Write a protein that binds this ligand. Sequence first.
Ligand SMILES: Nc1ncnc2c1ncn2[C@@H]1O[C@H](COP(=O)(O)OP(=O)(O)OC[C@H]2O[C@H](O)[C@H](O)[C@@H]2O)[C@@H](O)[C@H]1O
Ligand SMILES: [Zn+2]
Length: 249
Amino acid sequence: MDEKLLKTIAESKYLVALTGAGVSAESGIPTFRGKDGLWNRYRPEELANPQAFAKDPEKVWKWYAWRMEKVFNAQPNKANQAFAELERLGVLKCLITQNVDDLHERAGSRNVIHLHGSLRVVRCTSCNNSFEVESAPKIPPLPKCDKCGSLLRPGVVWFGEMLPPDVLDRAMREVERADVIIVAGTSAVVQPAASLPLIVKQRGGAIIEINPDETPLTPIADYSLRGKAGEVMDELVRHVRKALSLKLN
Ligand SMILES: Nc1ncnc2c1ncn2[C@@H]1O[C@H](COP(=O)(O)OP(=O)(O)OC[C@H]2O[C@H](O)[C@H](O)[C@@H]2O)[C@@H](O)[C@H]1O
Ligand SMILES: [Zn+2]
């Protein structure tokens, strides 16, 4: 929270952000890793991969329907509001997220890229039918496609699956032109998402990491703020808004 940091953000020409589960934590949604992380209680090998889904689609669907209900009923937090505001001010150009929740959207964020899909989306395992839901389905019975009758599945990316090419490519273009990237609430271990901030640095840009813990990205982060996204982003955006308002124009 020094002058240089504020300056780096306020004067940026193309600032982007990469967010992870930590940015939704203050909305009552647990993260995947860490203390009370979902992967520390539930096994990703049974709930986050095509093999597990094929083996027991009812169990996987029951788990996702539960997660969907949790997310749809949660409200965006201060971190979410701050990111939307930073975009409103014209500073944040694009928000790249690994989150499958829609808290960024409900806070007002517009240019959001969902690298790993979205819990709002349901798609067919056979044909190209896909659509969004307003609330979570009840399981059983297994959600079936109204077009061909095959099993439907959550529109999220599982381990071993390829992120949609057009989606990752868009994110790639964003980080290739960003001079500053805010990396908040992510453990920086899951690929290829974890590689995006490196692009910014390699091309000459700056990395501003926001996370209560240190991660594999910390060593190359120009700035690494040890705190919660809500508190840090709220203060950061407020100072940036103040700085911009002070400009003689
Ligand atoms: N209030 C908070 N503010 C900011 N960061 C926080 C907060 N609370 C926790 N964190 C940080 O959030 C990070 C979350 O790490 P992960 O649980 O691994 O979430 P993420 O990096 O988004 O996961 C990547 C991907 O893997 C998952 O399988 C899934 O597909 C996911 O998108 C942690 O480093 C943690 O310290
Ligand atoms: Zn179908």
